[PDB]
Amino acid sequence: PEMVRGQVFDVGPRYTNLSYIGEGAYGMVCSAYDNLNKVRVAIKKISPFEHQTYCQRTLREIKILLRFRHENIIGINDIIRAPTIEQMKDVYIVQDLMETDLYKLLKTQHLSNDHICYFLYQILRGLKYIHSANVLHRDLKPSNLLLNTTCDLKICDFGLARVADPDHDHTGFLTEYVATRWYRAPEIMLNSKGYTKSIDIWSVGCILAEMLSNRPIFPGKHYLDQLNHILGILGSPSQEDLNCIINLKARNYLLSLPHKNKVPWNRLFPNADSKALDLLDKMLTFNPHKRIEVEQALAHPYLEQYYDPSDEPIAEAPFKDDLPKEKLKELIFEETARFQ
Numbered sequence: 001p002e003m004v005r006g007q008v009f010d011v012g013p014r015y016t017n018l019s020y021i022g023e024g025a026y027g028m029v030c031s032a033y034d035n036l037n038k039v040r041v042a043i044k045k046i047s048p049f050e051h052q053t054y055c056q057r058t059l060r061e062i063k064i065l066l067r068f069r070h071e072n073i074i075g076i077n078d079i080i081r082a083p084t085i086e087q088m089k090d091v092y093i094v095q096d097l098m099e100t101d102l103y104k105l106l107k108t109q110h111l112s113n114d115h116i117c118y119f120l121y122q123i124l125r126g127l128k129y130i131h132s133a134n135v136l137h138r139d140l141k142p143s144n145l146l147l148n149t150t151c152d153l154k155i156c157d158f159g160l161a162r163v164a165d166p167d168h169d170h171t172g173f174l175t176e177y178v179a180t181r182w183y184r185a186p187e188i189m190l191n192s193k194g195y196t197k198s199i200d201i202w203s204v205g206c207i208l209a210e211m212l213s214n215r216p217i218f219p220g221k222h223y224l225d226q227l228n229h230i231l232g233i234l235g236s237p238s239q240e241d242l243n244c245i246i247n248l249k250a251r252n253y254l255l256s257l258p259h260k261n262k263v264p265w266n267r268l269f270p271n272a273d274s275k276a277l278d279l280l281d282k283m284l285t286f287n288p289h290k291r292i293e294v295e296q297a298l299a300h301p302y303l304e305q306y307y308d309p310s311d312e313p314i315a316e317a318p319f320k321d322d323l324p325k326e327k328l329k330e331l332i333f334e335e336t337a338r339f340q
């Protein structure tokens with residue numbers, strides 16, 4: 001078995017000439033030459049079987065990505081694992097090799113208004129498919145958006161995804177930890193479990209703001225500072241929006257704050273296209289019920305050069321917690337069997 005910086009990376013004989021790329025959420029990722037398709041690919045090594053939560057996340061990532069088939073969602077090209085459950089200690093997921101991620105691109109490159117428009121169109125096009133499958137990504141952020149050399153965008157990492165459940169979305173104040181802090185909708189901190197499609201729209205709004213300025217718009221230093229950054233720009237919520245917050249702890253917290261005025265988007269982003277700012281405003285709406293939906297966002301004038309509903313497909317079959325790690329290991333073994 002081949003080795004990559006003091007760790008086994010057993011993918012041969014199909015995959016050779018390994019090169020370390022970096023560390024993903026669940027471990028080492030390498031690039032390799034696929035001797036069958038004659039191209040370089042990306043290979044993620046996952047070792048999840050000792051922990052139930054690691055098994056849950058790996059199972060979600062695989063089951064979701066194998067069901068999805070969309071130009072703007074990273075696929076799974078192959079899955080490598082031992083022939084028997086007893087010998088399976090790791091799983092290798094093979095995916096198309098991309099040139100960069102939006103996180104890395106935002107750290108060093110200025111994006112033209114044309115690139116912002118095209119990237120936002122592709123994110124929304126992929127999100128339309130995901131949401132049409134009744135799935136919430138729940139961790140949209142720049143590092144989860146891969147780009148190839150021609151700026152084709154692919155959404156990745158469905159390990160934190162959930163089936164939408166708007167009826168069971170209500171919860172207490174300061175309980176929920178959905179998404180990565182900077183991209184977390186205000187309702188997560190107030191009264192939401194993050195089980196509605198509006199959570200993903202918020203994250204996309206955050207990504208759009210970050211493409212406009214190359215800096216996160218709400219860079220909370222910790223969990224409890226996130227809402228302060230949001231309110232610092234959006235201003236105090238209206239009486240109508242507070243009436244939607246029935247939980248007394250969350251409502252009274254918001255009522256205890258001094259009045260804050262809205263910071264105009266045009267002052268925050270003076271170089272931004274006015275149509276981009278109108279859409280940003282609709283995505284970064286405090287009240288989740290008034291927040292724009294993915295299909296409405298695609299139809300916004302900012303995206304008029306790309307908008308084509310006949311070329312924005314939906315899922316053919318939508319998707320409709322305490323399983324021990326032994327059972328989850330068997331389910332991962334069954335879901336990966338097709339690649340043997």
Ligand SMILES: *CCC(=O)Nc1ccccc1Nc1nc(NC2CCOCC2)ncc1Cl
Nearest residue numbers: 022023024029042095097098099100156157
């Ligand atoms: C879906 C997010 C993910 O897997 N990210 C990741 C983190 C670290 C290394 C590799 C990956 N995945 C990945 N990377 C690439 N290309 C790299 C090239 C170098 O710049 C970063 C992206 N291609 C595919 C995949 Cl799955």
